[model samples]
Target: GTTKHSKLLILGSGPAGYTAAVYAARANLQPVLITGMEKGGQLTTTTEVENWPGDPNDLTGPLLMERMHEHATKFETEIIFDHINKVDLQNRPFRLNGDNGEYTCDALIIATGASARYLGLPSEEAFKGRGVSACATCDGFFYRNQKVAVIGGGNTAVEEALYLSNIASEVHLIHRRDGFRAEKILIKRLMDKVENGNIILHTNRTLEEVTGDQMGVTGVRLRDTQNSDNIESLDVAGLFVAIGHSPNTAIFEGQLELENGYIKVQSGIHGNATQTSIPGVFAAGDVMDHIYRQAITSAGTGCMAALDAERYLDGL
Candidate 1:
């Protein structure tokens, strides 16, 4: 297959990707973009985007991403609705393989993002809206006045447990480790909730399975990893999985310098720009951000990436 010649190729169609496209296109780079598996990235999976600046009213994730897509295309940026299956970053006019065609560019911007990890259990997926959830902020409203169980021991887990305490009638935080991996400040807040009886912290326990019926979740079965004999099931209406997240950088692995699996970048005021270890290869969005992982932030970085790419191409 012949590659599409271009001065810049932005990989991803998320807020960051489109933002980059808007910038790259305006710079007269004639940038071509590849829309990955999740064209609009995690924002499409998200229900509402309230934290984004400029709007006092909340916006749906898909709606915001779609608008961003419109903004990109309106500027003559070409978007290919295909997931990038592979890439070659070793040389200029880098190679990218997709489902339908091939892409080659002088500058490549990686906006591939990340996704939350879920509990590996059959019932967890079965009752996703009924009782299981990955994001607390997104689904916590639905669980108001309900009893729920949260899995994980990190800062994310404890924070979620605390957040649910004020809304839910009762909250149970389950962790496989005996101690929490969160900061002292967060752990203290959670401990306060535990002391107030609003939340129950279950340590050394692991989620075995989510027990539910056709209507919704009834409870959760858990086993003590330390003592296998310690098995119990609790009646709960909701389950929030706070395990962690996996970066969408598998294809770029071994070809880029990633920090702890996340693409590394310079830390400072101009930090979010996706300048990778190699020239003409930049990274943006969640692929390079492990902290402050938000849709707006991702979009902001995407804009930065586009500016950077435009400047690079101009100097080329």
Candidate 2:
């Protein structure tokens, strides 16, 4: 087969990638979207989405992705299910080495997004999708009025704990360190919740194992980080691991300027805010956003990226 090339190429198939493809196709860019291995990014693993605008009724994550996929297709965006392993952005027509084949594009829009980091524990892996989750906004509803534990001490963990605090009967924040690494505002909010008896803090403790039965998770065993031998178990219905996220930008490591492993964009309300360090290359979604990881935000940036790419092509 000939090397596949397009005027605009979008990497990823989440809300960001698909939304970008829609805009690019509508702008007559004839964009080709390469679906990464995960297909729908982080949202697909989620059970339900309640915050999507215009949809009064809550929908499952897969359902939303399917509609987005169809929407992109309806707009003449060619969707290819291929995971790109390597990328060469130093050249004019950026080259991408995918599992299926090679691809090149004049303007590249990276919506690759980020992946939720998880504990490497074997039990955590075993209960994934059963009772173990990463997103509180996605799985918090199911755990309403039930006890749940969140592992981590950074901004993600604190945010997840706070989100779960409103739904779950009790929120247990288990962290390896006594001090939190979150923002002052967020830390203050967390402290208020703790004072109000909504969230419980278990500092200097690390998760030892997730205990569950055939039905699902029953509880988690935690070991004292200082003592190592001291162990305690808490009965909870759900466990959320909110350590942080890892952006999928390894392919663009040397080719792009990144901040904290995320692709750096212009980051403004300007017309070309999505423009990356390279003129023809653009970035959107969680790949470039560490502050807000919501789907709407991702889609918004995706729109900007497509328009930015369109304007870049117009100048050429």
Candidate 3:
């Protein structure tokens, strides 16, 4: 890997990273951004995005990222396509080792987002595109008027079940535990939907296997968590997994201060909220925030990280 240095280096090309580039470049920081393996991060895989402010009617994940991508290049942000495997954040002029090159920067901004967690079942692996999916927004349309099942006991799981209920004829929610770990409002909505709509809750259950054929998934075999001998099967066209997400922070495990496997930031309403344990190193996006993994929030934190990095490099 050829060695190169930058004034300010940003990692990850998600909404947060690109937003940071825009702010940093406009501020004359001449930021250099490294896009991980996925060019636009998780947003590229997401489908409809109707939450972006000012654009309510027409917007998709990739489409919104396109504007940000263009915005970064329109300025002075030098975007690089690379995957980093190592970093030396403990030292000044932070060093990073990427697949294509090596880099050292006066200040660093980490925006590496999170990834969806999947159940490690053989049957789940056997059928990926056929019927098994982790994102409801990405695959829910295919099961319109049909029956589908969602797994998990969290906000994403309940939200996916609700979304599917509006499209699919019936949605089966299978939770490993009897209780849910989501916000009260979301739980309330889920309960409301169950009372009058097409959502069914099956608590104390876990997805034992995803039963499917050559034509794709046809049903799922669920195991009762309370009783090992109990097994139940249901008919469904698709299976959606919404257990949780894991932040992409394995590379910085020892070098950076992490809380709950995510980068720890000095959070507050004040400036430098994005500062990491290392003064010159900052974190943004899903990599730093365990909750509220929204694109807008990620972009906002990216903006904050860029401003912090600018000040750090200026020695202010």
Candidate 4:
């Protein structure tokens, strides 16, 4: 295909990317939104989403994304399905090559979100969104007073464990390693929870399989990391994979300045908050945020990126 061009190009289809497209199109930017390989971003895999303020709290993740997609299309935002593999940001008009085509844009919004790590078990894969989850903040409410399990030993794992301790009847934290790799303070708090709180530490164990029926996750099969190939089953209503999220930034590695693998945007609530290290390029959503990776926050940054890009293109 011939090289396509747009006044504004938004990469990603998460709330951030779709929101940017909607805002940019309303700004008359004629934005081209490229839905990456994983079309709807992280939330596509999510189940029920209630964090999006204003009632009707029973919406599914895919449903919310579908609404965003429809809204962007209704505003005449060109939605293209393509996975961008490489980028050239040094040039005046940024160049991007994806699996479907090559493109260029005067201004860009990089909202190519992040991916939550999960154990590659058949049962786990089957139970995703039903009984398996990544964000404790997103799904903890559903498991209120229910038995739940968390996997990993990193900050994400420990943090989720602490967060779920209050909501869940029992938070069984499973880690393959004996020692945790989280911050000392978090570890201290976690240790305190083990003694006095509802958090239970299951060290030297790995999630072998997630056992559940068509309804959802009912239990977990754990393999003992220590003695023999011993297997243990724990009854839990849900599973939280706290291994952490990997921001989709490999293509823009050197051209775009990154922090902890996420796009490093200009700091502050100033005019160009979403602007990347490069002037015409802006970032939103999980691509630029490692802290608040919420849907609303991503949309907020998406709007900011679109405004920044419009102002930038207007200058050009």
TM-score quality measure for candidate 4: 0.96
* Cand. 3 TM to true fold: 0.77
Largest TM-score belongs to which candidate?
A: 4
**Against the true structure, candidate 3 has what lDDT?**
0.88
The 10-residue segment of model 3 with minimum total lDDT is 43-52
Which residue ranges in model 4 land beyond 4 Å of their true spot?
Answer: none
lDDT of 1 by residue, 107-168 (tens): 88888887889877887888766678777776787779989889988987888898899889
Per-residue alpha-carbon lDDT of candidate 2 for residues 1-316, written as tens digits (9 for 90 to 100): 4479888999999999999999999999999999999988877886667778987586877889999999999998998989889988888788999978999999999999988989999999999888999878767888999999999989899999988999999999999898889999989999999998789999998899999999778999988767557889999899999998999999988999999999999877657999999989999999999877889899999999999999899993
lDDT score at residue 84, model 1, on the 0-100 scale: 83
| Candidate 1: Cα lDDT at 269 | 73
lDDT of each model, Cα atoms only?
Answer: 0.82, 0.90, 0.88, 0.90
lDDT of 4 by residue, 1-316 (tens): 8699988899999999999999999998888999998888888877789889774667888989999999999999999999899999999788999988899998889999988878888888999889999989889999999999999989989999999999999999999999789999999999999989899898899888898888899999888766688788999999999898888999998898998899998868558899888989999999888877899999999999999998888894
Q: For residue 255, what is the lDDT in candidate 1?
A: 90
lDDT for residue 31 in candidate 2, whole number 0-100: 93
Between candidates 1 and 3, the one scoring higher on lDDT is: 3
Better of 2 and 4 by TM-score: 4
Alpha-carbon runs more than 4 Å astray in model 1: 54-58, 129-131, 137-148, 162-171, 181-198, 208-238, 270-272
